[PDB]
Amino acid sequence: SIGIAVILVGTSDEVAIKDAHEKDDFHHLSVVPRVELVAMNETDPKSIITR
Amino acid sequence: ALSVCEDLISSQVYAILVSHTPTPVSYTAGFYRIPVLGLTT
Amino acid sequence: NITDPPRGCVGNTNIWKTGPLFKRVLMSSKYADGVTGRVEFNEDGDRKFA
Ligand SMILES: *[C@@H]1O[C@H](CO)[C@@H](O)[C@H](O)[C@H]1NC(C)=O
């Protein structure tokens, strides 16, 4: 369950990233991915680091 | 950098002083383009 | 034609228009009497004739 944190900002289709996110499931992987979904507004480096 | 924003930048700061890579400080100042002079580096 | 840098980090993307000018002043800056004596700067603004 390897974690990966996906992050977007602004107008974007989250359910599409979810779509392709579930679309790919392959035993070719020797480990299962742990899919995560995240979004944010501001570009300020500090708060970016924070989240 | 966290304490630079919260503690420092929030104070409407013209300059900062640094000693000891301390480089992150400059990263912050630079995203703010704010001149800062330390000592020891 | 002077301004002030932003207070809060959040939501502020605009660099302070005068910062570079302030820098150049720091470049031209020559202090005759310091505690350590005279202080100088190079092309990169670094202590010279130390
Ligand atoms: C992002 O911005 C929208 C509107 O611009 C706002 O409703 C939302 O609360 C913001 N996100 C956070 C985490 O505050």
Ligand SMILES: *[C@@H]1O[C@H](CO)[C@@H](O)[C@H](O)[C@H]1NC(C)=O
């Ligand atoms: C910004 O500063 C310049 C330099 O002194 C001066 O022309 C004026 O204060 C401002 N610029 C304009 C076009 O008004």
